[PDB]
Amino acid sequence: XLXLXLXLXL
Amino acid sequence: XLXLXLXLXL
């Protein structure tokens, strides 16, 4: 679902 | 890097 991965940072 | 994806438990 969420936590680490994609969405913020990049 | 973060936000959506994996890390919330799964």
CA distance A1 to chain B (A): 5
Task: Give residue numbers after which chain B breaks (C–N above 2.5 Å).
Answer: none
CA distance B5 to A6: 6
- Sign of the alpha-carbon dihedral angle for A9, A5, B6, A8: positive
Identity of the residue numbered B7: X
- C-beta atoms surrounding A2 within 10 Å: 15
CA distance A6 to chain B (A): 5
A8 and B1 Cβ atoms separated by less than 8 Å: yes
CA distances from A5 to A2, B9, B10 (A): 7, 13, 12
Q: What are phi and psi of A5, to 5 degrees?
A: 135, -100
Subunit contact B3:A8, Cβ cutoff 8 A: yes
**Which residue do the tokens 């438990």 mark?**
B9
